[PDB]
């Protein structure tokens, strides 16, 4: 059986790590999967991995001995495909192509680069990459236009997730799912909803009691396997910076309307099934009332679109990139 490796910087839940976990579950019957990371944490306790390699040197943007340890790992474990996520991981995964033959796949994950300096690096690192995997049309546009990666390098196939449970009378229940630290901005959303007692906010994700006396603001804290989108009426993610957020994809497959910041690839989740916002208290309050005053129309479109980002529709394309 084929040996595939995922290399990441952090092992904490969320973002790329959740993606790695989800993709590993998808291909797990067709290959052996190895994890390479800088630290131990949530991801490294996952049983899907045939083996886990913790190299703390990965936390450094570059380091020769870390590079050589990666080479040793690929060769000794006969790993013929390496899928890299995050900048640091990407640095080692592509430099090590100079030293080892394997299929090197670097995944965009929103190009958190944020500046024309990281852009330069990524452009030249693409020369060492067998596949630049863009997980959103907006990541593809950034790669081609802002970074300078050539299109022959790029395979663009959207992120997607397993279908969340779907549901109910309108209860004006808003749901926020994600880390509470910047660029994420739940404080902005909670503030808006706090002044509207008929609405409510549940936040899933340091931590806050600014709203300790707002009766309609509820912090559930971190919930690792959150799948209860179907209990809520509206998913809202307010943030200064996003790629194509997994939580947004999840809400989408759960057929609930969305209220998202107009950043990164959030617009790719919205057709008639929600609204894009400026991170203004005014703009968020206005578009919130707009959806809730006209709710069944946004709900009908959420329902209509809810098959769009379901991972079964993308599986063969994913498997083709990774196993082909």
From Swiss-Prot:
Molecular functions (GO terms): glycosyltransferase activity
Reactions the enzyme catalyzes: N-acetyl-alpha-D-galactosaminyl-di-trans,octa-cis-undecaprenyl diphosphate + UDP-N-acetyl-alpha-D-galactosamine = alpha-D-GalNAc-(1->3)-alpha-D-GalNAc-di-trans,octa-cis-undecaprenyl diphosphate + UDP + H(+)
Function description: Involved in the assembly of the O-repeating unit during O-antigen biosynthesis.
Species, as recorded: Escherichia coli
Protein name: O-antigen biosynthesis glycosyltransferase WbnH
InterPro entries named among the record's database cross-references: Glyco_trans_1, Glyco_trans_4-like_N
Something else known: O86:H2 and O86:B7 subtypes share the same O unit, but the O units are polymerized from different terminal sugars in different glycosidic linkages.
Domain of life: Bacteria
Pathway(s) where this gene product acts: Bacterial outer membrane biogenesis; LPS O-antigen biosynthesis
The keyword Transferase belongs to this UniProt entry's keyword annotation: yes
UniProt EC number: 2.4.1.306
Gene3D superfamilies, per the entry: Glycogen Phosphorylase B (3.40.50.2000)
